[PDB]
Structures are given as structure tokens and as C-alpha cells.
């Protein structure tokens, strides 16, 4: 029947669109083997088309060298856009464009073979077998320049990293040969440094055929595969906010493009990939779509794909955000460049991620000193019989008569001869002396005033009541706004308001403030209310945003960007780190729900925050707010692991603090934002102490004071206390101070003094010695803490204080909870009995 | 013309009907009589459309056309596109009894403990008849056990109403009156605890075991732990991948919250293991309690996709979005999910759309941030009341019957609550260390015989008929037979001697990690590959058969892991929990990457025994050493594991000889103690010709926590000439010994601490007592001053042994932000400075 045949043609059209990719000739190695007739000339309704013409369009679009996955996309306009661009007769590239593609393949393979000759076996993680990644990346960048965009920022692992640096970003060949030689000048040898395949670079890309230029950057990274992914996103988002493009901009161009490269085993196996993809369309994190390239060489070291993933493709995780996926044959450079341009066009049209799965192979072992035939003999027997993409592409151009055999040979020896001359120039250089690496501490140094005036406090207070017309405030939120106006004019300022006084005053001075984390708009402890929601309409009001406008109506240049994060730690912390790298003038704070969950971001803390300056010269001013304290809420609601951050600390790389007063926290944040130093800040913040009526500050503590790294009891600095009566000195940090002070007051213990160390790192050596010198009759000193003996500040202070200050801390003893495997007990009642034991020992 | 329109409409409902399904309980957002061709049969358009609307546009949103396997798409199509038989009155009354228990348990706790956190299931009650349907369907298939992992939402409710944890025990937790067994160790919060029981079918004649594992607050961190736990139980039952049958008769039932399922990367890493040979469990049943909120955060700020379950499309799992206010549809989808899992041994996901009746926690006000959502929730009758009215309307039950059944359950709880309230109050004491809970009673022999060494050596050459060995692999096999009979045994062979001898004794040995079959440093060759055919040979598997041909009962399970740390370490931890008699080792490619599994180390490995009474014997092998390969190829962060150490929770070692590593592994496998082992293993030292052991070190010795130089124990060295004592651990010993030999420094001695934790206090004192003329002592290490063993040893050695270590000084690299320098040449100059200071 006629109605019967038309319906089966509709099923065939759907079959090619949905599953044609399973039959596309995408694998250059062809490792897998398993991978009527009278109706062809009859016409069918689609316009009317002959079945033969319908099928040829479908086979060409879906079953040649490109496997298209797009029918999983829920937006019909996105499916239609792809359908219309892939189901057409494509215009062949010009001879000039083909010669340009060959010039890039030439550079890619000849760079690798040169290094094989000069530095045999030495680790370089060659791109050989995946040379088409260079004309593919060139096509991405050129298409971004065609759209008139501002910058392309790249993040990538080790595979062909040295090739991308030299042949895409423009890192001088001489500098790459200087790393191989191990002859580093003083600039190159600064800090502790990192391996050659982890370094970054920047340059200007000039269009070969077009009239535009675009900036190209490549960020630094650790060995930890995919860990840089959220860092790239944050870095790009900060550059977009600065250019007033994208989400927090005036134009929707998102004119800074993330280009993210991956390896096949890492893309499927590392969870941070899913966490980063999850940020792609979020208001607080979107970058208008990332261009992903997977260098799918169908191996991970010695591991076969069947042991690396539980899905058909290494890119199947990208289906979580409905991204289109293009699987392309790495031996077809024209198809590779075409997919790269289509991906940029899709990203520009829908501001969403696009994934390119480039199927290729690894010419050599995992690293150039490894033999891959021991574990993959069949794969390497096939690779051995293979002509590279450069030679195959050259033969195609010679066959078409576009270039001659002599021209191709000449261009090869010209590039080889070029490398030899740069190689010999570098070899002639006088050898720099090799010295032990030195601390970066002195590279960045801090009179900085952080006090504000009464008018500033009052303005921030009044902003909380300058509600939009007809705004219905929630009845339990209204007292917070009214109490803040009261605190601003009368004092008794609590921690939550002191934080907003610091951020609000920075905004009024013209600073961009970005604050985020889990339920951070309201605050986990219902304390912040950075955003308030209309009880009747759901409309939002952000009081601190009013501080971005001067009293005369002019802008300050400042802004308040406050968001609820996704439920992530690894990607969220990575993003905020990257954001502060991308905009050093921004105040960037990430808040943990509880300090106990920041161990989910351990790779970012270890590999970027604590060590990036010494390793790469990369600076970040990110703040981590870690709610911390022994309150009887259990082992996962007690500790931000102070001891781990103090262990990681070295070379003045981070500032670590546990403030005990609202005003000292205010001055800490203002010093951090205004010091001109780009170094992370770790703050152990309160929970119950937010509502401790003793933990409040006077107006003069904000207007006539500064950050105090060491604090004495107010009875000695302002009261009638006698320091000479003190025979026992208790040294502590954080909320336990208020419990020790309450016990001293109850028992009138004039023989005991409590000294707080507000800044845990760097140790305030001079301030501590000066403070202790004011108590001449001290006979015994104790470090008092809530935390178990193997936790808190004792593991580092117990070793460092008697060493740095021998005349003050020889014989320093510890008062704490016993050493524990978990950060606390799970029972509130057990916590309470242990807490009272510390207080009784301290005054016993 | 019209037939092609119908085929497009059929495809449209199958592909996208889920976008129009009535799944959200809150609701926040002429040709009909003609026949068409669709076994191939003709059907009226009205019937085609009816079947499609019922299957895809009612209370169930089906996502399955993304599945690449056509037989899986057909299977779902044939079961959803049919006229379903309505549940029986008895089954409906049973569903109502489950909703009654779920809601009345929550409202009871509200009345008695109004100011206490319980993370109520209210607004998601259908989770209980849904989980009951999963477990009952598993019992219908005659399976052995259902193992549950879940977060905080309705946890206390699941424990009481699904697993059978006594109400009296849950009420005693709320009362804060814990008896000595309940108060053991440091413990954890009530909504993190586990339980076990036997589920008896209501209508069928089978029973099935049901367990619920413990977890930390870290949402989704338990996911790989559940998988490993189930895989170990399957291997023991001889079911699944390493079993005689393919029933995979132990089922993982994994619950999640909507914001955590989309946001936590460990979800993707765990899903990635689902069909892997070394990790598959024959499919996990996933339930997302999708209450469309994450604390105060709206879904639009939690994910970048339409559904919270879209990550499960990475493995082509079918996804069923179901209306939480339709308990019959919820139970039906639960049974279909179990049937799919049994048919295809692949994961199934149920996205149960529901709401959170109260605030995030019962003390939080959600109307400050979600006023519109809570104005809608306030006008809603719960699922229990709505289901009751449906059954009364149909005339199956009376108003009085429903009222009586609810009063009885309430009255039942009151009586248990008052009984618990009458109990005498236990004294509250500070928590105590778990160290003494596990101790070896007597001396444990780990030495073997020459026959055992030779047997393992010969196994490397007992190649299958016609096997072509790679030419660079053949010398490894030959050198091992040589080492077995003549000595000079290297580290790589000593490891296989330990595992092979355990297999010969009947032990299950599971070893895995990144490129672990061959070994990162081309040193292991646990699996060898035929140069001509690709066929694999595993020499240690021959040790699972005695010389007489009988089985030993032992087995060698060796795998290349996925490129994961978090899920792989979580899995091996769970595997070791699931089978305490197994030897379970996870190997880091380089110790530097284990920080990717920090949540597992912090929340499970180092603390699970003290927190939950949960024991694991997992081994972590962390390649470590300063060799000039950079900050991410140098350190397994010794200092972090030593900081985490307390209460004898873990054994931490850095052996310097192959024989001592052999004895360490054998002691660990045979001691009967279930406590993790952290080993800092070598890289260059694998091929150090000085770092070899004699046959007698394996056959006539034991593990030594402290090692002296052989010149004093076996040679002509004079301990009395020593005035400087160097204490160290690991490979730096060989560099210090070489410098001493070169300069004939009889005034200097080098003592190795092989076992870093627990500190070998007695052996250290006994050893140092044999050097009476020592005037100065130094702790010497490669690692920067804020790293290695110094941060803990510098503080603990002068305290535990004051007469030996008062005035102990450090020789190391300066304190550093990264674990080393990035330059090989800079590493070398720093390495020589340590050696020059030590002998200066
Ligand atoms: C397991 C592993 C590699 C295999 C990658 O496979 P694929 O993703 O398919 O990429 P490709 O190599 O096929 O292009 S390269 C890398 C290693 O670290 C090298 C890379 C680096 O250090 O920068 P190595 O020194 O252990 O080999 N390595 C160790 C490793 C483990 N775990 C993490 C999180 N990061 C890592 N770098
Ligand atoms: C952010 C967060 C929660 C929101 C969960 O949302 P969803 O996944 O949609 O679940 P549901 O609550 O809607 O069912 S509950 C949990 C917390 O820790 C409670 C749970 C627990 O501690 O076991 P809290 O004490 O901070 O509230 N919390 C903190 C948290 C942060 N990061 C991780 C990895 N784990 C966590 N437990
Ligand atoms: Ca700063
Ligand atoms: Ca053991
Ligand atoms: Mg690869
Ligand atoms: Mg939720």
C-alpha cells in the first residue's frame, strides 16, 4: 500500500537521525568487525523527494566520518537547527583553506618527531596519532574570531599539551627547548615550579582569511585529570563579568569562550566532569556554553575502554545536560575542522555546551618510554601498519593536483630546518646554576587602614529598610532588617551583620563582591538574609546592592553577586578559585554549609589553592568560609579540619583565621579585599556563636580599630584588670574563649588570663611575644582547645610555638579532647560532658 | 498519508510524552474510529491514542528511547503499552497500611520531640509502599538479599517501617538514654545508622534479607561503598560476575535526594562502574526522593537539566518519573524496575516527584525563601488522606475502619514510647577509644617454606599450551623462577609471593587500581597477554589449585580500575566490609592522586569503626618517593594519614625491604583484625639492586616494625662507635647507607621505622638501648618539614619515649606549599643537601 510505504520511510528517516551514529565510519583503526529496491526511484512526501535522494542525504549526514547524537535534546528548535545544518550539500573547503589545514598537520607531526630525535624517550606525551586536534582547535578559535568574540580560554590535560602551547597558543619554541634542556633562567626557575606539560601561555590569534583577531589563553593545571574543568569555568565567568558580557553583562554574546580538552578514560571516570557540566546553565555559573574536545585515542595508559566506562561512548555523561555530541574520525581533518565550526555556531546560537568526540589513536606508548605492545599487542599491530593523518592528507592534496610532491617535501624540511636553528641557539646558552627551590613568601607583602566611618555603618543599616514600593517582608525576616538598622546606629553588632558591613563597605568603595555557597543567600543558620523574598509575590530584594550607587545617584563601580550554589564542593570551590584568578580586583567568597564538607573539594585545596602560587606563579585571593565548632551536632557538623589547613600551610601561601568577635571578622575581610595581595584566606566561622549575646562588637571597634591577630581580655586593655596577678596563661582560639571567660568571671579567677590567637597562619610571632611580655608573673601556659588532641591547632602549635618563641613557650602544655578518629562524638550529651572536662581542667 | 502521521504521533508520545505527564503533585508550573497498521496488527486510532496517553501521559513519565539496545526499548514498550490489571482490594489495603505507618510515625515524633531534627518523610510517604514493592518483587524473583544505602530524608521511617529496627531503639536515641552497646565508640547521629532484618512476603511465600548500611552526612559518598558491599556478598554467594549463576541475587537499592543526585560527582563515577567486569552488581535500583527543593535552594539553581535524574542517561538507564501522590503507580513502577534489572542486569532509576511537608529540618521555616511553594503545600491533603478517600469512595473500606486502623497504630506507638520513658537513665560518660576492641591474642607466624616460593616462581613459567609471551615480559617470568630458587627477591615478586601464598591457603584476594594488572612501573605482570592472540594468563590463579588437583578455596581477582579515585576507593572499602575474610587491595597510580578519595578516607576508612562499629580491612597502596618527577608524582601525603590516625584505627607502613612488605601483607591478611592498612610503596626502589631480600627472610623470619643496619645484626659492625643516630623510613635509607659506606662512617647509625602507626614504642626503645654512646639523634626525611613523618614524630617521639628522644632534631627539605619542586635538577641538589647535613 501507498500509506504503508510512506510510514516505513518516516521510520527509516527517524532511524538514521536517532541511530545513524552507531554505523558512522568514525574509528580510524577499525578495531571492531561487528560494526525493497524498486522503491528507491519512487517519490515520497517529506516537498516531494525520491527515496534514493532521501537515503543519500541521510547516509551522508549521519553515516560517513561524523556520528551525530542530537535527538536526545529536549528543545525542538535545537534539534531542528542541527538537522538543517547536517542534512544539506556542504560546500567543499577552498584550496587555500586545505593548504592551511596541511600546514597545521605539518607543524603538529614535525614538532613531535623533532622532540623524538633530540630528547629520545623523555616524557612529552606526544599528540602523534591525534595531529588533527591542532587544525580542529585552530577552527574553533578562528570561528570564535568570525563571531567577533574577545577571547578563547583553554584548559587541557597532558596529551599534545606541548604541541598546543607551541602550535596554537604561541609559547616560543626556544622556551619549550629550554625546559627539556633543564636550563632555566631566574624567571623560569621562580617558586617550586611544575612539569612542562602543566604550564600555561597567552597570545593573540590573527585570522588567516578573516579580518579579526582574538585573545587565546591556556591556564595551568595539576596532574589531577579534569580537576581544572571548574577552574576554567570560573576563570571565564570572571572575565565575562569584567567585559559586561553574558549573564552579568549588557550583551548576551558571552564573548569569552571556554575550550575544554579531555582524554577519553578521564572524561568517563572523573566525577568533577559531571559536577562542572551541571553548572553549564546555572545563573551563578553559566559561561554561555563550553566547547569540549575529547582526544579519544581509545586507551587510558594500559587500560582498554571496556574497563574504563559502562557506556558506548566516552562522552555519554554530556547527555546529562542535553548537549549535542559529534563523534568525528580523527583521520579526516576537513570533517574535524567542519564539526569544530558547527560546534562554535551551536554554542553562539543556544549558549549551551557542545561535545566533540575526536576518535584517533596513540602512536607511541602512554609516555614515550613505555612499551604498549605488552598489554595492547593487537592495537599496536594495527597502528604500526598506519600512515599518519599528515601523510594521508598530503597524498589527497597531491592526487587532486593542488600541490606538488616537491612543495610538500620542501615545506617539511623548511619547518625541520627552522626547529634545528632554534634548538642550537638554546643549546649555546650559558648554563644557569641549579639551586634548591625557595619560598615565595616575600613575593607578596602587605599601612593599610580598614576602619570605616559612622556614616558608612548607618548607610548599610538603612539599606536593610530601604525596601522597594509595596514589598511584603516575611514576618520572621522583618526583625532582622530592623535590628540591623538599630545595630548600625547603637552598636551590639553581631557576626552576621559585621560580615555584611565589610562586604557592603567594599561595594560602596567600588569593589565587585561575589559570595556563594550552599543556601548562602539566606544563610544555613538563618542569619545572613543577603537576599530577602517578598512574602506575597516571591520577588527578591538584595539590600547590599543599594551600596553600588552613591548618594548622588552615580555608580560606585561596585556590585554584589550573591548566589545559592549547586550541591557541589569540588566544582563550586574550583569555580570560585578560578573566578578570583580571572579577576584579582574581585572579593570572592565561597561558603561551606558546614566546614566538614570542604574535604569534598580536597583536590582543589591541595592542587590549586594551597600550592598554585609556588607551582605556577598563579595567584588567587579566594576566601573559604568554613562553619566550625564543637556544639554536639556530630562528627560531620563540628570541624572544618583546622589541622589539615595548618599542615598544608607554608611560604605564606594562605592566611588562616578563626575570629572570635564580629569586628575582628569585619577587619579581616576588609584587609583581605584591600591589601593588594592575591593569596587565599581560610576562615573558620561560627554557628551558635552567631547568636551569642557576648559575641557582639561596639561601633568604635569598626570606626577606630583594625584587625588584631592576637586578642587580650577587654578587662586588661579597657577595664580595671591586673595583668600582674596572672600566674596561669590560657592560649586559645575561637568560641571556647567565651566559655573560659564565663568560668573565670564566675569564680573571680584573677590568677588566670585568656589570650586569643585570631590569625592561626602566618603565626603572629611579634604580636604574641609582645602580648605575653605584659604578664611577667606567668608560671604555666596551656594551649586550650575543643578539638581532639590530633586535631585543631595543637598538632602544629605544639611543635612550632616552643621552637619560634623558646623564651615564651618552652613547657607549653595541651588541654583538649582526647585524640579521636572522628572529629567528635555522635551524642550531644557525650559532647557536653567532654566540653565541661576541658573547662574544669583549664581552671583546675 | 494519514498512516505516516500516526507513526509520527506514536514516536512523539514514546520520545516526549513524559514532558506532558501529570507527574508533579503540587502542579507548580473524526479519524479516531478508522483503523491503522501498527506481531503486526491493525488498530483503531482511538485505541492507539488511549494506550499512549495511559502509558506516557498520566502519572508516569517514561524516558527510554535514549537506550541504545533495541531489545531493552521493546521490553519497556511491551510492558507499558498494555491495559494494566488494577491492584486487588487486599493489595490496596496493604498499600494504605504502609502510608498509615509512614505518616503516623512522623506525626507521632512531631508531638513527642517537636524541637528535634528527624528529616521527616512527610510529603513523600509513598517512598515506604514503593520500597516495600521493590523488596517484595526481589523476593518474588527468589533473590537472597536487598542492601539499601540512603541519605537523611525519611531515614528513621525506612529503618522502622522497611528494615524493622525496633521503635524502642529509635525512641531511646531521641530520649538520649543509650545503653553500653549503643554508647560504644564515638558514635554517630540517629539518621546515619544502619539495620538488618528478614522481609516476609505479605502475599507470596518467600522471604528475603534486608540490610541498610551506615553512612556519613556527605551526600552520595556511600554510593560506591554500597556497590562494593553488594559485589563482595555476590562473590561469596557465587552469584553474578565471579559466580556460577547470573542471578546477581544481592540487590543494591540506592536512595537519593534531588539536589544531591544532580550536584555530586561521585554519582556519575558510581554509575560508570555499573557494567564494568570488576565492579558490576547486575544493576542498581535507584529511587530519587524528588521533593523539588534542596534545603532553601530551588531546582533551577541546583541543576542545568530538565530532570534531577538526567545523569543516569550516561549509562542508558531507563528513567521513570512518577507522581508521588499516586501510591499504586509508585508500587507498579517499583516492580517494573526490579523486572527490568532482572532481565538486563542494568540500573533503573525512579524519580519520585513529591514535596517536603515541613522545613528542611523540623526546626527550619521554609516560607522565608519559598513562600509560594509553602502556600500550595498548606492547601494540600497528604497522600495517606487522599488514598483513604479513594478507597472509601470505591466502597472497599468504611470511614470507621480507616479511623480505627490509624488509632491502633497511634496507640501502639504510645505504649512503646511510655515503656522506653520508664527505663532507668544510663550514666553519660566521655566517649572512649576503640583501640582495645581488636587485638591479636598471640604471636602470628607469617613465614612460608621454600616449596611455596618455588611453586609461585614456577607458576610464572607454567604457561598455557602454545602461549606467546611478549619478548620484554618473558625475562620477568624467568627472573621470578630464578628468585624463587636462588634469592635476591625484588619488591614486585615479594608482593606476589604474599598474595600467592594467601591464595594457596584458601584466601580470596582482590587487587585493583589504575593499570594494576601490569603495574604502573611495568613491574607487576599479575596478568600477561599473548603477543599473537591477545589471550590473558594470570599466574597466581594456578595457586588456587593444590598439587593434588583439589581447590584451595582461594581466588585471585585482579582488575584494571576505571580512572576514578573517589568511587574506586569507596568500592574497595565496601568490598572489604562485605567480606571480612577477603584480602582487598586498592592501588593508587601515584599516592598523589588518593586526595581525590579524601571523603572516603576521612568519613569511612579512618573513622567508620569508632563511628558505627563498621569494620574494614581494606589496603591502600600508595606509590611514594622523592625522585624528581614533580609535585604530583612524589607524595602520598604521609603527614595527612598520620594526622587522621587515632585509636589504632589504621596500620600505616613504609617498608624498605621486599621481605618486610611480604610479612606486612601476610600479617594483615591472617591477623583476624579488621582495620585498614595504608602502605607507602616504592617506584625507583622497585629496581634498586640493594633493595632485595634473601630466601631465609621469607621462610625463617617475620614482620619487623623497626630495622637496624645488617652490619650490626649480621655483620662485623660495632654499635659502641655510634655517636650520631639517624632515624628514618623508606627509600632514603639506601642513600644514607651508601654515603656511610663511601666515607666509612662508623660514628653514624641508621635505624628504620617500618611501621609508622601504631608507633612501635617497645621495639624502638629496645633497639636504641643497644647504642649506649649516642650523643645526638636526628629524624631524617626526603619530605618537606611540614610533610612526611616529622609533624607527628617530632611531637610524639619526645613524649612517648622521653629518655630516648628528648632533643630529637629534624633533617629534611624546607617546609613547602607543594610536595616537591617541579624540576628534576632542583630535586637532585635538594636531595644531596639532606645527605650532606646528615653526615655533616
Ligand atoms: C591514569 C592516568 C593517565 C591515563 C589517562 O588516560 P586518558 O584520559 O585516556 O588520556 P590519554 O593519556 O590517553 O591522552 S595520565 C596520568 C598521569 O599522571 C600523566 C598525566 C599528568 O601527570 O599530567 P601518569 O604519570 O600516571 O601516566 N594518570 C594518573 C592520574 C590518576 N588520577 C588522576 C585524577 N589524574 C591522573 N593524572
Ligand atoms: C546541602 C545539604 C542538604 C540539602 C539536600 O538536598 P536534597 O539532596 O534535595 O535532599 P532533601 O533534604 O531535599 O531530601 S542536607 C545536608 C545536611 O548535612 C543534612 C543531612 C545529613 O547531615 O545527614 P544539613 O545538616 O546541612 O542540612 N546538606 C549538607 C551537605 C553538603 N554537602 C554534602 C556533600 N553533603 C551534605 N550532607
Ligand atoms: Ca587580597
Ligand atoms: Ca586484617
Ligand atoms: Mg585516551
Ligand atoms: Mg530535595
Amino acid at each position: 500500500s501507498i500509506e504503508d510505504k510512506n510510514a516505513r520511510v518516516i521510520e527509516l528517516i527517524a532511524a538514521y537521525r536517532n541511530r545513524g551514529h552507531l554505523m558512522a565510519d568514525i574509528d580510524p583503526l577499525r578495531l571492531d568487525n561487528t560494526r525493497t529496491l524498486w522503491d528507491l526511484d519512487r517519490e515520497f512526501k517529506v516537498q516531494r523527494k525520491k527515496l534514493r535522494d532521501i537515503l543519500s542525504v541521510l547516509r551522508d549526514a549521519y553515516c560517513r566520518h561524523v556520528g551525530v547524537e542530537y535527538t536526545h535534546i529536549l528543545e525542538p528548535e535545537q534539534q531542528r537547527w542541527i538537522q538543517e545544518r547536517v542534512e544539506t550539500k556542504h560546500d567543499k573547503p577552498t584550496v587555500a583553506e586545505q593548504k592551511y589545514i596541511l600546514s597545521k598537520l605539518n607543524a603538529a607531526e614535525a614538532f613531535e618527531t623533532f622532540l623524538q630525535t633530540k630528547y629520545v624517550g623523555q616524557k612529552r606525551f606526544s599528540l602523534e596519532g591525534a595531529e588533527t586536534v591542532i587544525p580542529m582547535m585552530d577552527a574553533v578559535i578562528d570561528q570564535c574570531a568570525e563571531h567577533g568574540l574577545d577571547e578563547v580560554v583553554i584548559a587541557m590535560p597532558h596529551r599534545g599539551r606541548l604541541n598546543v602551547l607551541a602550535n596554537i597558543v604561541g609559547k616560543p619554541y626556544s622556551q619549550i627547548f629550554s625546559e627539556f634542556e633543564g636550563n632555566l633562567n631566574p624567571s623560569q626557575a621562580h617558586g617550586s615550579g611544575d612539569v612542562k606539560y602543566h604550564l600555561g601561555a597567552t597570545g593573540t590569534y590573527i585570522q588567516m582569511f578573516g579580518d579579526n583577531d582574538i585573545e587565546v589563553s591556556l591556564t595551568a593545571n595539576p596532574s589531577h585529570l579534569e580537576a581544572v574543568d571548574p577552574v576554567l569555568e570560573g576563570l571565564v565567568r570572571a572575565k565575562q563579568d569584567l567585559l559586561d558580557t553574558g549573564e552579568e553583562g549588557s550583551d548576551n554574546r558571552f564573548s569569552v569562550v571556554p575550550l575544554m580538552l579531555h582524554g577519553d578514560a578521564a572524561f568517563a571516570g572523573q566525577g568533577v566532569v559531571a559536577e562542572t557540566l551541571n553548572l553549564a546553565l546555572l545563573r551563578g555559573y553559566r559561561t554561555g556554553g563550553t566547547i569540549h574536545i575529547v582526544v579519544n585515542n581509545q586507551i587510558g595508559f594500559t587500560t582498554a575502554p571496556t574497563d574504563s566506562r559502562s557506556s558506548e561512548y566516552c562522552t555519554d555523561v554530556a547527555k546529562m545536560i542535553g548537549a549535542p555530541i559529534f563523534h568525528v574520525n580523527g583521520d579526516d581533518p576537513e570533517a574535524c575542522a567542519w564539526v569544530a565550526r558547527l560546534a562554535v555556531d551551536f554554542r553562539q546560537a543556544f549558549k549551551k555546551d557542545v561535545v566533540i568526540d575526536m576518535l584517533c589513536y596513540r602512536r607511541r606508548g602512554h609516555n614515550e618510554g613505555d612499551d604498549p605492545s605488552m598489554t595492547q599487542p593487537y592495537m599496536y599491530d594495527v597502528i604500526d601498519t598506519k600512515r599518519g593523518s599528515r601523510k594521508a592528507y598530503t597524498e589527497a592534496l597531491i592526487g587532486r593536483g593542488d600541490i606538488s610532491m616537491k612543495e610538500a617535501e620542501d615545506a617539511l624540511r623548511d619547518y625541520q630546518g627552522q626547529l634545528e636553528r632554534v634548538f642550537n641557539e638554546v643549546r649555546e646558552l650559558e648554563k644557569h646554576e641549579i639551586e634548591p627551590s625557595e619560598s615565595v613568601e616575600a613575593d607578596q607583602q602587605i599601612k593599610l587602614a580598614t576602619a570605616v566611618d559612622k556614616a558608612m555603618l548607618q548607610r548599610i543599616g538603612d539599606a536593610h529598610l530601604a525596601l522597594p514600593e509595596g514589598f511584603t517582608v516575611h514576618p520572621r525576616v522583618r526583625p532582622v532588617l530592623e535590628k540591623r538598622r538599630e545595630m548600625a546606629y547603637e552598636g551590639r553588632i553581631d557576626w552576621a551583620f559585621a560580615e555584611l558591613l565589610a562586604l557592603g563597605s567594599l561595594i560602596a568603595e567600588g569593589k565587585l563582591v561575589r559570595l556563594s555557597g550552599q543556601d548562602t543567600q539566606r544563610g544555613t543558620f538563618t542569619q545572613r538574609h543577603a537576599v530577602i523574598v517578598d512574602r506575597k509575590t516571591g520577588e527578591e530584594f538584595t539590600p547590599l546592592q543599594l551600596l553600588a550607587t552613591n548618594p548622588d545617584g552615580t555608580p560606585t563601580g561596585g556590585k554584589f553577586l550573591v548566589y545559592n550554589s549547586a550541591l557541589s564542593e569540588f566544582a563550586a570551590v574550583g569555580f570560585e578559585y578560578g573566578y578570583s584568578v580571572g579577576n584579582p580586583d574581585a572579593m570572592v567568597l565561597w561558603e561551606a554549609q558546614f566546614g566538614d564538607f570542604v574535604n569534598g573539594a580536597q583536590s582543589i585545596i591541595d592542587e590549586f589553592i594551597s600550592s598554585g602560587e609556588a607551582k605556577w606563579g598563579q595567584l588567587s585571593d579566594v576566601v573559604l568560609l568554613l562553619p566550625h565548632g564543637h556544639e554536639g551536632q556530630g562528627p560531620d557538623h563540628t570541624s572544618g579540619r583546622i589541622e589539615r589547613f595548618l599542615q598544608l600551610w607554608a611560604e605564606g601561601s594562605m592566611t588562616i583565621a578563626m575570629p572570635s568577635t564580629p569586628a575582628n571578622y569585619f577587619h579581616l575581610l576588609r584587609r583581605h579585599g584591600k591589601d593588594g595581595i592575591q593569596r587565599p584566606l581560610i576562615v573558620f566561622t561560627p554557628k551558635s556563636m552567631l547568636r551569642n549575646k557576648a559575641a557582639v562588637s561596639d561601633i568604635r571597634d569598626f570606626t577606630e580599630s583594625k584587625f588584631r591577630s592576637v586578642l587580650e581580655e577587654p578587662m586588661y586593655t579597657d577595664g580595671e584588670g591586673d595583668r600582674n596577678k596572672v600566674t596561669r596563661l590560657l592560649l586559645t582560639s575561637g568560641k571556647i574563649y567565651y566559655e573560659l571567660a564565663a568560668r573565670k568571671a564566675k569564680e573571680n579567677r584573677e590568677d588566670v588570663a585568656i589570650v586569643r590567637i585570631e590569625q592561626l597562619a602566618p603565626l603572629p610571632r611579634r604580636r604574641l611575644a609582645e602580648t605575653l611580655d605584659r604578664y611577667p608573673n606567668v608560671k604555666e601556659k596551656f594551649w586550650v582547645q575543643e578539638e581532639p588532641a590530633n586535631q585543631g591547632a595543637w598538632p602544629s602549635f605544639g611543635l612550632t610555638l616552643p621552637e619560634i618563641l623558646p623564651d615564651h613557650f618552652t613547657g607549653l602544655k595541651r588541654i583538649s579532647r582526647r585524640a579521636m578518629s572522628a572529629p567528635s562524638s555522635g551524642s550531644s550529651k557525650v559532647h557536653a560532658v567532654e566540653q565541661q572536662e576541658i573547662l574544669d581542667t583549664a581552671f583546675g
Side-chain angles (χ1 to χ4, degrees), chain A residues 518 567 569 593-594 597 637:
Chain A
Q518 280 153 31
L567 215 165
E569 283 82 21
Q593 181 130 110
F594 288 84
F597 302 115
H637 293 83

Coordinates of all heavy atoms in Angstrom, one line a residue, chain A residues 518 567 569 593-594 597 637, ligand 2:
Chain A
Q518 N 26.3 26.8 49.6 CA 25.0 26.1 49.8 C 24.1 26.9 50.8 O 24.4 27.1 51.9 CB 25.3 24.7 50.3 CG 25.6 23.7 49.1 CD 26.5 22.6 49.6 OE1 26.4 22.1 50.7 NE2 27.3 22.1 48.7
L567 N 24.6 21.7 44.7 CA 25.1 20.9 45.9 C 26.4 20.2 45.5 O 26.4 19.0 45.3 CB 24.0 19.9 46.3 CG 23.9 19.7 47.9 CD1 22.7 19.0 48.2 CD2 25.1 18.8 48.3
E569 N 30.9 20.6 46.0 CA 32.0 21.2 46.8 C 33.2 21.3 45.8 O 33.7 22.4 45.6 CB 32.4 20.4 48.0 CG 31.4 20.6 49.2 CD 30.2 19.8 49.2 OE1 30.1 18.7 48.5 OE2 29.2 20.2 49.9
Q593 N 28.5 24.6 53.7 CA 27.3 24.6 54.5 C 27.8 24.4 56.0 O 27.4 25.2 56.9 CB 26.4 23.5 54.1 CG 25.1 23.4 55.0 CD 23.9 23.4 54.2 OE1 23.2 22.4 54.1 NE2 23.5 24.5 53.5
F594 N 28.7 23.5 56.2 CA 29.5 23.2 57.4 C 30.9 22.9 56.9 O 31.0 22.2 55.9 CB 28.9 22.0 58.2 CG 27.6 22.3 58.9 CD1 26.4 22.2 58.2 CD2 27.6 22.6 60.2 CE1 25.2 22.5 58.8 CE2 26.4 22.9 60.9 CZ 25.2 22.8 60.2
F597 N 32.3 19.5 55.1 CA 32.1 19.1 53.8 C 33.1 19.6 52.8 O 33.2 19.1 51.6 CB 30.6 19.5 53.3 CG 29.6 18.9 54.2 CD1 28.7 19.8 54.9 CD2 29.4 17.5 54.3 CE1 27.8 19.2 55.8 CE2 28.4 17.0 55.2 CZ 27.6 17.9 55.9
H637 N 29.3 17.8 61.6 CA 28.8 19.1 61.9 C 29.6 19.7 63.0 O 29.0 20.3 63.9 CB 27.3 19.1 62.2 CG 26.4 18.7 61.1 ND1 26.2 17.4 60.8 CD2 25.7 19.4 60.2 CE1 25.3 17.3 59.8 NE2 25.0 18.6 59.4
Ligands
LIG2 C1 23.3 20.8 51.4 C2 22.7 19.8 52.3 C3 21.4 19.3 52.2 C4 20.4 19.6 51.2 C5 19.9 18.3 50.4 O1 19.1 18.5 49.4 P1 18.4 17.2 48.7 O2 19.5 16.4 48.2 O3 17.4 17.7 47.7 O4 17.8 16.4 49.9 P2 16.4 16.7 50.8 O5 16.9 17.3 52.1 O6 15.6 17.7 50.0 O7 15.7 15.3 50.9 S1 21.0 18.1 53.5 C6 22.8 18.2 54.2 C7 22.8 18.2 55.8 O8 24.1 17.8 56.2 C8 21.7 17.2 56.4 C9 21.8 15.7 56.2 C10 22.9 14.9 57.0 O9 23.7 15.6 57.7 O10 23.0 13.7 57.0 P3 22.5 19.9 56.8 O11 22.7 19.4 58.2 O12 23.5 20.9 56.2 O13 21.1 20.2 56.5 N1 23.4 19.3 53.5 C11 24.9 19.5 53.7 C12 25.8 18.7 52.8 C13 26.6 19.3 51.9 N2 27.5 18.6 51.1 C14 27.5 17.3 51.2 C15 28.3 16.5 50.1 N3 26.7 16.5 52.0 C16 25.9 17.2 52.8 N4 25.2 16.5 53.8

